[PDB]
Design a protein around this ligand. Structure first.
Ligand code: K
Ligand code: K
Ligand code: K
Ligand code: K
Ligand code: K
Ligand code: K
Ligand code: K
Ligand code: K
Ligand code: K
Ligand code: K
Ligand code: K
Ligand code: K
Ligand code: K
Ligand code: K
Ligand code: K
Ligand code: K
Ligand code: K
Ligand code: K
Ligand code: K
Ligand code: K
Ligand code: K
Ligand code: K
Ligand code: MG
Ligand code: MG
Ligand code: MG
Ligand code: MG
Ligand code: MG
Ligand code: MG
Ligand code: MG
Ligand code: MG
Ligand code: MG
Ligand code: MG
Ligand code: MG
Ligand code: MG
Ligand code: MG
Ligand code: MG
Ligand code: MG
Ligand code: MG
Ligand code: MG
Ligand code: MG
Ligand code: MG
Ligand code: MG
Ligand code: MG
Ligand code: MG
Ligand code: MG
Ligand code: MG
Ligand code: MG
Ligand code: MG
Ligand code: MG
Ligand code: MG
Ligand code: MG
Ligand code: MG
Ligand code: MG
Ligand code: MG
Ligand code: MG
Ligand code: MG
Ligand code: MG
Ligand code: MG
Ligand code: MG
Ligand code: MG
Ligand code: MG
Ligand code: MG
Ligand code: MG
Ligand code: MG
Ligand code: MG
Ligand code: MG
Ligand code: MG
Ligand code: MG
Ligand code: MG
Ligand code: MG
Ligand code: MG
Ligand code: MG
Ligand code: MG
Ligand code: MG
Ligand code: MG
Ligand code: MG
Ligand code: MG
Ligand code: MG
Ligand code: MG
Ligand code: MG
Ligand code: MG
Ligand code: MG
Ligand code: MG
Ligand code: MG
Ligand code: MG
Ligand code: MG
Lengths: 77, 51, 64, 96
RNA sequence: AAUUCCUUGUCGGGUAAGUUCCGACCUGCACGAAUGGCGUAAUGAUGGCCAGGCUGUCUCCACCCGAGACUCAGUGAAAUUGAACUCGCUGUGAAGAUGCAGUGUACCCGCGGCAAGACGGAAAGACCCCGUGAACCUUUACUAUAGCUUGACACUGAACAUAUGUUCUAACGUUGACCCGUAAUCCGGGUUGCGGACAGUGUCUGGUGGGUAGUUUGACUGGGGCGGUCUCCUCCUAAAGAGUAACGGAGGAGCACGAAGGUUGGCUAAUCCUGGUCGGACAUCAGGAGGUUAGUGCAAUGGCAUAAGCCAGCUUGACUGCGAGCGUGACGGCGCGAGCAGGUGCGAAAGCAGGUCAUAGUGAUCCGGUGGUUCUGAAUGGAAGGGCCAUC
RNA sequence: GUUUAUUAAAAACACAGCACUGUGCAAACACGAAAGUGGACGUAUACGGUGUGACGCCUGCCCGGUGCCGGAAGGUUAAUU
RNA sequence: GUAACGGGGCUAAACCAUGCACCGAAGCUGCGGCAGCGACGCGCGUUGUUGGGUAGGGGAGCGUUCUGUAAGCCUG
RNA sequence: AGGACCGAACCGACUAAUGUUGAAAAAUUAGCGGAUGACUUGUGGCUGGGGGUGAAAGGCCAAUCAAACCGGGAGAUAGCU
RNA sequence: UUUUGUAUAAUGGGUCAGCGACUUAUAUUCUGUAGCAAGGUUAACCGAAUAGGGGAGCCGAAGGGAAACCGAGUCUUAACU
RNA sequence: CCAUAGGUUAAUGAGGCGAACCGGGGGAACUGAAACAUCUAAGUACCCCGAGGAAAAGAAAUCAACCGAGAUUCCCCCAG
């Protein structure tokens, strides 16, 4: 007859906006994410929704770093 | 919801107010906070009033 | 006869120097307490009509 | 303006502003217009006689638009800082 | 049962055999007392059932008499019709073929017959759905409204008594009587009686008002209806960027919090084992094992130890103006944001703070309200109203 | 008896009878912006409306709901002021 | 109505493997012609390339009646 | 005596067959009901369209009826063919 | 013609001839073309006057701001990097 | 009872028709609003009355804005 499902939320367009080696202007969003899947490295800020954004003009650099092998995003300015 | 809107009115007599919500039942004491009044351009005591 | 202005559009849009239209932002009439100051502050200045909408505005305002 | 029944743009946006009655009776005079009046006195009446401004204009302002190269007396009109410099540069007077 | 779904109920009668009929039973799905109950002689082109008679109704048709049909002479229609050199079959194919393929059959043309096909003719399917179509009907749908009804004021006055009561006459009524116009009963005038400021009518006003009128009465949908659904968040479907459907599979939201926010300083979980007043499986205490299997104000996912988890001090950055740049949207919008100015909190300081681990907790515009602001102010000064800012 | 002229003649409609109810006469009611007219040249043994439907035996319980009828102390309440 | 190779027929004219022939389209090439677009030269040549089309957009024309040109021109 | 009986005229229309580009836009043929009555019929009159009239079928109101016909608003509107 | 798709057994047409459907007015924008050019152009009207007159107007050469107002700037803000 | 109503006679005028235009008394709905009620259509269609060669309007208890204009009517602007 009827079903109790049939709901879903709008897709949030998360994920990587600027990949490795891409030249960005300061302020450019590099990744939108839920929590810190990626962490802010050098010249990268972490917004209130865990958005990583460039704090300097330069090139995006993904790196695995530290004792937990966490993924950091940096900007090579 | 439960929480009702209030205005925080400037003690400087500028007319300037902030607005916020308040659970009136759990907290009946008047909300008082130092907030920036942009008319006098100073932090002054703001006090709760009706919206 | 003369085309009639859509008078509601004339109250919402003003033509700018290069033939664009400025309008006031939606969402700043009421239900303001819940809105962030940042959000409301960005809604205060007038904005330009987007490319998708200029055709609709121009149709409504032949004497703008 | 019909969008298929979606609230159209000219209704989902707020009305703003009011129309000034004073703006309708206010004009702007270019520096180029100053040499088009007869006699080299630029008043409200001399501009109206030269068909620079409409007959119902009560207020007029000379702006720095175009150029002036004659001594013109400007009387009873507002003048911009740039227009005033240009009028005075060409030997004119701004009478208020 | 004109009512009984189950049901051809069951029992009895009638028949060789009876879902009907008649008589009962009561288990009345869902009789029932004037939208009458139960009877009832008579009546009925009324419904059901049985029997005698009667018969071509039938077994099962035969023959005959007439009117057509058939032939000749005369007259002379019609519906229909893209064009036709207009076969069968099996297959194919807008899925049921004269027309395609393959194959079989078939000399050319009438006439009388028959209706299997030409999805034959006839009527832009009446069912069904759709259209923000129509009509008429209904009502405790909406909005009106005739009518009915309420009061105020008017036409409408006078005494006396304590806004009401009584009395009065002169307005007003009279579809009482009489007189005259008059040859008329209508009507008007006159006289007189009876009512009498009442009634009645106008304007305004509350009620009532399917009597009447105009209309509304959503969409999605494996047809429609019924049910469910409609915005927002999380996961999966989703094919390792983004996005991605179904009445696909699972759950949540329509808040909470002046601390559960800011900052400084500090801290680290579940669970179990061993021992220990009451005390048990589980309370609190002690040690160890363990290593987040906990925790997160609330779903799920992604996060989280430098904790984002837990505790305390001091606090109001849950600041105001802005904003390089970027994300995400058809758009309206929504989001992230360093940095700048002002002023602030915490910290010795570096610093951190423009709410909350993040992602739901929402509503355009119009209309109007409140506060601020001489921006505007229809001769002028004001004001009203409008604008702008804040907010409802 | 009546009825769907032209697919329904009936169990439908009507009917005498019954009941409820309104109506005091310028009747109620109806047709009429109104004047008037019907009701009726009638007058409650009359007239209108409604339901039932010869006759026989009868017609039980419920007034909470919706109407209607009566009440009106009090609550609420229009124009007006 | 054969009716589950399209048929005839087939013991290969079936299937598998290998190989070389050939047939086969409006594909490609040849020859002649037309047009679009673009070069490179001087509207012409040379040369490259393109030319299936519904909705639909763009470009360029034919013919018809009428007015001027026309009291002209053609026409018993 | 009788909305009494049988049955012609007269009024009707229950059944069947025919007819269905009819002889006929409702009939013919054989049967059928009423036939002194709430009967039937001639002539004339009155009622008018949200109106009439209706022993009530939404029947009938000129072969037209859940709102006649004619003319007008009028080229209504038609997101449909 | 309509369609995802029609020899379709979906639609329309018996045939011929004639007629039969994107117009007209005004406004507005864009393109082409012509005139004039920081100007361009007149409307009614006058004029027998397609002339000539008529520049009332309209558009343009300045914008910004809700507005006062300022003006190659302006608005925003106490003030802008 | 005066009188009046009423009655008769005389004179004068009216009556009816007509396409539009005009002034007045009444006055829709379809339609549009993508439904619909406010609103629209529209004071339109239509009905009625009255007039004239035209009608109506008209000689400021009008505008204006501190300057001024000078009855009414009609046309172009103002201005979608
Ligand atoms: K980016
Ligand atoms: K029953
Ligand atoms: K009853
Ligand atoms: K064949
Ligand atoms: K046949
Ligand atoms: K009297
Ligand atoms: K009275
Ligand atoms: K009603
Ligand atoms: K479906
Ligand atoms: K199905
Ligand atoms: K805290
Ligand atoms: K700061
Ligand atoms: K009968
Ligand atoms: K009761
Ligand atoms: K009618
Ligand atoms: K179809
Ligand atoms: K068909
Ligand atoms: K054009
Ligand atoms: K041009
Ligand atoms: K600037
Ligand atoms: K209407
Ligand atoms: K519509
Ligand atoms: Mg998701
Ligand atoms: Mg690490
Ligand atoms: Mg506001
Ligand atoms: Mg001028
Ligand atoms: Mg049964
Ligand atoms: Mg039985
Ligand atoms: Mg039995
Ligand atoms: Mg038998
Ligand atoms: Mg029985
Ligand atoms: Mg019953
Ligand atoms: Mg009863
Ligand atoms: Mg009965
Ligand atoms: Mg076949
Ligand atoms: Mg034959
Ligand atoms: Mg036959
Ligand atoms: Mg057929
Ligand atoms: Mg059809
Ligand atoms: Mg109704
Ligand atoms: Mg309507
Ligand atoms: Mg409707
Ligand atoms: Mg639907
Ligand atoms: Mg993906
Ligand atoms: Mg992928
Ligand atoms: Mg897609
Ligand atoms: Mg914290
Ligand atoms: Mg927290
Ligand atoms: Mg949270
Ligand atoms: Mg309004
Ligand atoms: Mg004033
Ligand atoms: Mg004034
Ligand atoms: Mg009978
Ligand atoms: Mg019949
Ligand atoms: Mg019959
Ligand atoms: Mg009477
Ligand atoms: Mg009965
Ligand atoms: Mg009873
Ligand atoms: Mg066989
Ligand atoms: Mg070839
Ligand atoms: Mg080729
Ligand atoms: Mg080709
Ligand atoms: Mg081509
Ligand atoms: Mg010619
Ligand atoms: Mg008899
Ligand atoms: Mg009859
Ligand atoms: Mg007979
Ligand atoms: Mg009899
Ligand atoms: Mg008889
Ligand atoms: Mg019926
Ligand atoms: Mg008839
Ligand atoms: Mg009707
Ligand atoms: Mg019309
Ligand atoms: Mg039409
Ligand atoms: Mg189909
Ligand atoms: Mg084909
Ligand atoms: Mg087919
Ligand atoms: Mg066909
Ligand atoms: Mg065929
Ligand atoms: Mg069709
Ligand atoms: Mg056909
Ligand atoms: Mg300007
Ligand atoms: Mg006359
Ligand atoms: Mg509509
Ligand atoms: Mg006159
Ligand atoms: Mg004066």
């Amino acid at each position: 007859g009827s079903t109790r499902n049939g709901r879903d939320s709008e897709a949030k367009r998360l994920g990587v906006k600027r990949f490795g080696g891409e030249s960005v202007l300061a302020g450019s969003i590099i990744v939108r994410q839920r929590g810190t899947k990626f962490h802010a490295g050098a010249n990268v800020g972490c917004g209130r929704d865990h958005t990583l954004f460039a704090k300097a003009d330069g090139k995006v650099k993904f790196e695995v770093k530290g004792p937990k092998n966490r993924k950091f995003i940096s900007i090579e300015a | 919801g439960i929480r009702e809107k209030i205005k925080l009115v400037s003690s400087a007599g500028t007319g300037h107010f902030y607005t916020t919500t308040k659970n009136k039942r759990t907290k009946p004491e008047k909300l008082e906070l130092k907030k920036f009044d942009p008319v006098v351009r100073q932090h002054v005591i703001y006090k709760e009033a009706k919206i | 006869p003369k085309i009639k202005t859509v008078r509601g559009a004339a109250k919402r849009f003003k033509k700018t120097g290069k033939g664009g239209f400025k309008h006031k932002h939606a969402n700043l009439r009421h239900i303001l307490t819940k809105k962030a100051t940042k959000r409301k502050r960005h809604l205060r200045p007038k904005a330009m009509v987007s490319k998708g909408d200029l055709g609709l505005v121009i149709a409504c305002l032949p004497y703008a | 303006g019909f969008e298929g029944g979606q609230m159209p743009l000219y209704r989902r946006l707020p009305k703003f502003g009011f129309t000034s009655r004073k703006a309708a009776i206010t004009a702007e005079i270019r520096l180029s217009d100053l040499a088009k009046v007869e006699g080299g006195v630029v008043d409200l009446n001399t501009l109206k006689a030269a068909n620079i401004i409409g007959i119902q204009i009560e207020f007029a302002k000379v702006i720095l638009a175009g150029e002036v190269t004659t001594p013109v007396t400007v009387r009873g009109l507002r003048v911009t800082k740039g227009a005033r410099a240009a009028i005075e540069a060409a030997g004119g007077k701004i009478e208020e």
